[PDB]
Paper text:
DGR-programmed variation of Mtd enables the phage to use alternative Bordetella receptors for infection. Variation in Mtd is focused on 12 adenine-encoded amino acids that are fixed in position and scattered across its C-terminal region.
We isolated, crystallized, and determined the structure of Mtd-P1 (120 kDa per trimer) bound to the 60 kDa ectodomain of B. bronchiseptica pertactin (Prn-E; residues 38–640). Structure determination to 3.16 Å resolution revealed that a single Mtd-P1 trimer, although possessing three independent receptor-binding sites, associated with just one Prn-E molecule. A total of ∼2300 Å2 was buried at the Mtd-P1·Prn-E interface. These loops nestled separately into two of the three receptor-binding sites of Mtd. The third receptor-binding site of Mtd was unoccupied and sterically occluded from binding another Prn-E molecule. The other loop, composed of residues 190–199, made less extensive but nevertheless essential interactions (see below), with a total of ∼585 Å2 being buried at this interface, and was called the “minor loop”. Although the three separate and independent binding sites of Mtd-P1 interacted with different chemical environments, they were strikingly indistinguishable in conformation from one another and from unbound Mtd-P1.
Numbering used by the authors:
A (entry chain B), B (entry chain C), C (entry chain A): 5 to 380
The structure:
Amino acid sequence: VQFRGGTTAQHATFTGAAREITVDTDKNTVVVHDGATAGGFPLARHDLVKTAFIKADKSAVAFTRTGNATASIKAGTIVEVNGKLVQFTADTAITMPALTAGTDYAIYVCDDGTVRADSNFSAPTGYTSTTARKVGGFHYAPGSNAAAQAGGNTTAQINEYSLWDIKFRPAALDPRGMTLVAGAFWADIYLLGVNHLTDGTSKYNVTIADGSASPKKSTKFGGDGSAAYSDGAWYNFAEVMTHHGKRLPNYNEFQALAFGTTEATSSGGTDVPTTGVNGTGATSAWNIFTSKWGVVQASGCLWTWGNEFGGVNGASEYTANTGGRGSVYAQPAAALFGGAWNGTSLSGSRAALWYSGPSFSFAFFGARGVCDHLIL
Amino acid sequence: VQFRGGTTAQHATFTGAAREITVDTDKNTVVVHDGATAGGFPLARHDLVKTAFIKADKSAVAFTRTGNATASIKAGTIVEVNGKLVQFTADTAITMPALTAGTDYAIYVCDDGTVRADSNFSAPTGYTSTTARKVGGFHYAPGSNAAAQAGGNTTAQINEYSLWDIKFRPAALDPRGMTLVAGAFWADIYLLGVNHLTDGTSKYNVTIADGSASPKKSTKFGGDGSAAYSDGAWYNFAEVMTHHGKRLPNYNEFQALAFGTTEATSSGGTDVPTTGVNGTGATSAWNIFTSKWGVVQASGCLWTWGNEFGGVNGASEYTANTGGRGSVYAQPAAALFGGAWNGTSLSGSRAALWYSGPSFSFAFFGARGVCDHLIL
Amino acid sequence: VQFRGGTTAQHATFTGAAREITVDTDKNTVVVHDGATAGGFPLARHDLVKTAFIKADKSAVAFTRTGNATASIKAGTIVEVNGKLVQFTADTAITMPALTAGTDYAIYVCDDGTVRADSNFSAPTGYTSTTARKVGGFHYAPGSNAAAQAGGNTTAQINEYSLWDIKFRPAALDPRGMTLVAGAFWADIYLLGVNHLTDGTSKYNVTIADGSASPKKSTKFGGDGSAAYSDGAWYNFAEVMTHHGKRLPNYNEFQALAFGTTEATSSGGTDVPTTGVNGTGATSAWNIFTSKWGVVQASGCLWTWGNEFGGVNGASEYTANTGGRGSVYAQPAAALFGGAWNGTSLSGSRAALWYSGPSFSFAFFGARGVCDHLIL
Ligand SMILES: [Mg+2]
Ligand SMILES: [Mg+2]
């Protein structure tokens, strides 16, 4: 049984009858007619909505934290997956696996109509990347967010602001282990690791990069993949953030990301070698330094290099101190934020040092990444 | 009447005949056939195109200002609304309500085909938020944009540059009261007001937040809703902007946004308390200071905190002047731009003072929000 | 041959038998029925997927460089065009026109299903802009990208990093002549030219705008189209980049964009007047200074104004040197990056001079443009 239609050319001058239906054999699609309009009204093929993702409210993430280890996908969420339409007419709970503290999770909507979370970032368990479509994700943090200005506990839970969908996410290449600050931008939850190449910039429980344990050399910038930079200069940390589509914080970004940390306090001890854990001889616990947004070790554990210049200038005369890539002249200091483990009273969300030249390297100087917030 | 059916599983290994129409009982959709392809060619369900919005020219707003109190939606605009498709094949006038000077309006495309503007940002008069879709809006200014470099006048009219649509808008979380500057970025039309929590950062005829009468404390940073900040520190304004997903203008931004103001001229008198009105005992009228882009009181009224550090340094010794959030060493000044009522002939689009540290606070230091331009 | 359908009102409370097809005369669309659900299942009109563009991997450009003068469109690409659906199920070679060194090309997809490049940015030869759709583009460079840190050659070829599609492009208002740096942002390939108004900012083999040969006044800021600026001031270059929706680079950006250049080397000679060719009396070839991402004359040719302030301040009193647009107090120098031709061995990817005020101008002070990377 066949309905006669012709080419798109044929259809162009053809006017079907009110409620008549022809077939465009060029497009392979149905065309509805109204008995008055030349060409009719072609319908859309499904190939042209492949990957559609409609949220009821586009200005907020697609999910909700319902408990410490539970989350729901919001009502009104329409999702194309593997030729099929999956939609949720009411808030729907997301099936979780086991949740280890300090790990990242991806959220999948599957072609059977079920929504599941998983530690794997290609496909969840018992599905392929064709049967399941990754739509978002979250971080399962070691501790809670700062309920006020004292920090948070050490109850492992979902970081409410680490929730991202594919149209409400960090601008950077990989969205993992970042958190939405004030709904304005994204900050790395953890300070930059040494193995940022395999781990990402922001990972829980890894060696923190500093003047000594300097970061792996960026492969985008002539790094071989296991070699590290010879020092912990600003130049080096700035190079690393670029490689991951991020930048160092500015003052206004820092004072914001780190709010909620315990002010004018430091980790104490002789070192903070590891993200999310207590420092070597720490006189106060890591979670005392946890922002309102779940930025871990926000302040007073390690100075982060910044992306702003000013303060104390170097020699008013050309100096070749740039890892042998040119010379500086009257070179202003590159900001350092937060304080480190050993400035007791000095540390905090607005703590700022404008003395160090960008070529300076010390074991109190690391970095935290940021990037824009993109809503689509 | 009922057509040859089958499940997606069944459709998979089935080749229909040229112009045969089958129904996929799983997908609930029509499938066109060509007598050649396995599985045929499934059509798209309308849900997967919900909220669609297609512009003819994607790098321009969807509307044209046609006169002081009239504007039109451009030809080629296709809007999905409430299951319906509404489109404008020619330029169509937008139905205006009463327009009061210094008001923001929203533009709605209704399912009955009409396009109207209303002061209400949820639904126009005699429509539900289902039957009408908000697609953009504009600001009805209290005066003209600056034709030359002598400011504008006092004739209420649509600021042409203030037109935004859902895919051509300020990146900020709320589009109201902003104006697009040289198609590069968005700027607040008005200086930051005290009650920015209920008014947004930019609003006509409100009290201008300054060092004395400072801004309401930010909800997202531990404000309660009634509390003001203690003073008008750079730190505070910076934080108020971050709240609304805006930031302070940099030098390049400022010089762009303020262009068209009457250069080397100040308001005179003793104070500027209100946005969009004349200053207290002022010597030249407020519109003298309107920019090419409809930025009201662009210069020579209040200094605006910028987002750039440099110039005169504070003490070369840690100082706890950050409202109790850490200490600062050799802190460079936060830039201020524009000049103020007392500024005499120093005011203008490139007026810049690199003196005050971020901790300073005066009755002639305020702020203006800027943000990114979003084209989708 | 009619199908019994009615209005949307009517459809609202109606249930067809499983596989009954009706016509919504309001929406002019087909409605599938299941036997259970009221209102049925309205299908999507083609209008609502007009301009659709679907990549298999959204985080990468849609094309692949296959050799010096050949490229393919990636498998999985789906393009709506002129009411039709063109789609590439495997890597398909783009049809190349005649390739000339230092020219931008636009990649089109056409309703006859063919994919071709062309120097015309409206339509390829033998098509209207209705039958062909601009989807991407690239730069045919005068030399090669930097293999390591010695620069490149003079073999004309496709700069692989200059590939852009409509959902993977410079945020700038016009994507021509840019190249993506480490996947984080886009940088102009060429130093800003005098006739940027008609050439864009980044164009091969034109006069490089400097202090003597100042650029043309932006028509967005009072320029007429003929008039040049009186000097090569930071203020002016900054104005020019705003006009084109770009920024002056920052330090983190510059070290990135210029990486791969021959470090500690300058053009030598007396002057460098033209983009992409050797300087007047130069002692090193122009391609010696070609970056990893094919930034041409990246360093050691002209100081490029930066978008950072710090270093040497100026008169600690209100000076009016902003070309009549107000006064500056204790004005911090504007950064200058890369070094110039005279600079000798100071020049390089990190060469930075914080001495010159924003009002200074010299015949070795130019600019390069940058903008964000847009992914959709
Ligand atoms: Mg800056
Ligand atoms: Mg600075």
